[PDB]
Write a protein that binds this ligand. Structure first.
Ligand SMILES: *[C@@H]1O[C@H](CO)[C@@H](O)[C@H](O)[C@H]1NC(C)=O
Ligand SMILES: OC[C@H]1O[C@H](O)[C@@H](O)[C@@H](O)[C@@H]1O
Lengths: 225, 53, 214, 53
């Protein structure tokens, strides 16, 4: 079957020539073409230059004409790229896709059907280890509700697991989406939705379940009036 | 179509007497071709080799 | 070389609605345009190839068609799975460009939020940066226009604003007003105030913050 | 060109009226193609899709 999977090197460092490998589920591209797809975080996405599976020809993004190179050989299941000069806009979810070999309307029309797993490959400029937790103690125990929370700044690598109350979530807990920073590190402010009825008794301990650290720093509601 | 087709003579139908044919036409993209379909009678097409051509 | 506006940008609809998305092309591309369904967390799947040929497997609810510079994909039987963005892809000329982004949203679960002020705890004050939060809980839609005054000014970046995506248990939105500002100017401005209004809020309120012990 | 050019009418010049077109066509040999560049007036040329050629 023509099913695709790619991981390459994962999260990388800027100003370096990365190599994002990709694989096939046995559907050899003997006549079809393979291609890359870059999907920016949210919103739109951009197409990276496709490859000619049958021949040795390489097509590229006009703005990135010389930046992309791939390795092709007799086996059709091994497609690995050699993207050069990774930039700040390369932090996106890459993809693999297979060109239509034949159809009743046309033959090589790019209406990609087979698609890969897809992973978020970033361009974070530094490792910078892991996050820290910041409480959100309310003024009271305009509004009558007092909502606590947490702030987990500079977490790496993307992603890092977070839960609540050792997994024993009580009611309507949630987490904010991942947002990057200008320096390259990833920060988040894990604040939970709080009802305007049960106050002074509810507890929302923040479970930052980082892979090496895995700490469960306490966080409760207290007056700050 | 209408199956009855008001068949007074009931002689038959064109089916299995014409060969609905298509051929490639060039395009700007490298190695990409379309189909320009047409209908031709069997008396104006022959096959030499390369079955289904 | 052929950008695709794909207007409108956003739309909210319920199950089995009659909302349509029209793809705006910079030049005529004939009928060479494809479609994709970007279900959250998954790769896009082809929906309408050759701009009118319905893909195999998927039903005929996708009332698509059109020729020239305009293409509309109207959905009849809207489904929970179909609530995802759509990207029409042209392939007539190189390079290939995708759609501009058309996120589709549920119409339901109109819930109102509750906003409050939250002073920094010990960990923030001892650390370099603290935060003043005007947390928004269970609101709708994504038009939370939080206003912040800091010495007669508003600053971005530290205003870590990222509204959560639509939920399935509550199908509403949660957003916080975290202001990660260092005490050099955070603690400098004695009094803060967040000005928020929302159409889901019948009576939007403005919350003002008092410095720490004050 | 020279500066004055003896501009009796002062009406303009061939710029925005002639185009430098550099296409590629065959020689007398059926298997030899060369980039031939020639000048053609804008009244003899129409613009087609992919509006850069
Ligand atoms: C004609 O020459 C141009 C210039 O390199 C080239 O791009 C084009 O492919 C040529 N046309 C042919 C070989 O038919
Ligand atoms: O289509 C012809 C082409 O087919 C494929 C490869 O075997 C090439 O070497 C050959 O030139």
């Amino acid at each position: 079957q023509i099913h695709l999977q790619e991981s390459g090197p994962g999260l990388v460092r800027p100003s370096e020539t990365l190599s994002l490998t990709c694989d096939v589920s046995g559907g050899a591209f003997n006549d079809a073409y393979c291609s890359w797809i870059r999907r920016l975080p949210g919103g739109s996405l951009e197409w990276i230059g496709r490859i000619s599976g049958r021949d040795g020809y390489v097509e590229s993004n006009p703005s990135l004409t010389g930046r992309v190179t791939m390795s092709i050989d007799a086996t059709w299941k091994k497609i690995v790229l050699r993207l050069t000069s990774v930039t700040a806009s390369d932090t996106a979810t890459y993809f693999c896709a297979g060109e239509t070999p034949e159809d009743d309307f046309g033959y090589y029309q790019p209406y990609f059907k087979s698609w890969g797993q897809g992973l978020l490959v970033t361009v974070s400029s530094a490792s910078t280890k892991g996050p820290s937790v910041f409480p959100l103690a309310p003024s009271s125990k305009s509004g009558g509700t007092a909502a606590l929370g947490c702030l987990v700044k500079d977490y790496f690598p993307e992603p890092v697991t977070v839960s609540w109350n050792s997994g024993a979530l009580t009611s309507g807990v949630h987490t904010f989406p991942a947002v990057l920073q200008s320096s390259g590190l990833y920060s988040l402010s894990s604040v939970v939705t709080v009802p305007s009825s049960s106050l002074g008794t509810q507890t929302y301990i923040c479970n930052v379940n980082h892979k090496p650290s895995n700490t469960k720093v306490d966080k409760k509601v207290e007056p700050k009036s | 179509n209408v199956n009855y087709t008001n068949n007074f003579p009931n002689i038959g139908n064109i089916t299995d007497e014409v060969r609905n044919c298509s051929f490639n036409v060039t395009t700007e993209i490298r190695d990409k071709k379309q189909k320009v379909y047409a209908l031709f009678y069997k008396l104006d097409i022959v096959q030499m080799e390369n079955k289904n051509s | 070389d052929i950008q695709l506006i794909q207007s409108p940008s956003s739309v909210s609809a319920s199950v089995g609605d009659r909302v349509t998305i029209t793809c705006r092309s910079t030049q005529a591309i004939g009928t060479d345009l494809a479609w994709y369904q970007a279900t959250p967390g998954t790769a896009p799947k082809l929906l309408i190839y050759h701009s009118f040929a319905r893909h195999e497997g998927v039903p005929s609810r996708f009332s698509a068609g059109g020729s020239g510079s305009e293409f509309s994909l109207t959905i009849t039987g809207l489904q929970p799975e179909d609530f995802a963005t759509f990207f029409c892809q042209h392939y007539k000329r190189l390079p290939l460009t995708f759609g501009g982004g058309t996120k589709v949203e549920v119409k339901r679960t109109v819930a109102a939020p509750s906003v409050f002020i939250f002073p920094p705890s010990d960990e923030q004050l001892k650390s370099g940066t603290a935060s003043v939060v005007c947390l928004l809980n269970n609101f709708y839609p994504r038009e939370a226009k939080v206003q912040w005054k800091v010495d007669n000014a508003l600053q971005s970046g530290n205003s870590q604003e990222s509204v959560t995506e639509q939920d399935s248990k509550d199908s509403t939105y949660s957003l916080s007003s975290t202001l990660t500002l260092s005490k050099a100017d955070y603690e400098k401005h004695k009094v803060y105030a967040c000005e928020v209004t929302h159409q889901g809020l019948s009576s939007p309120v403005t919350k003002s913050f008092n410095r720490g012990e004050c």
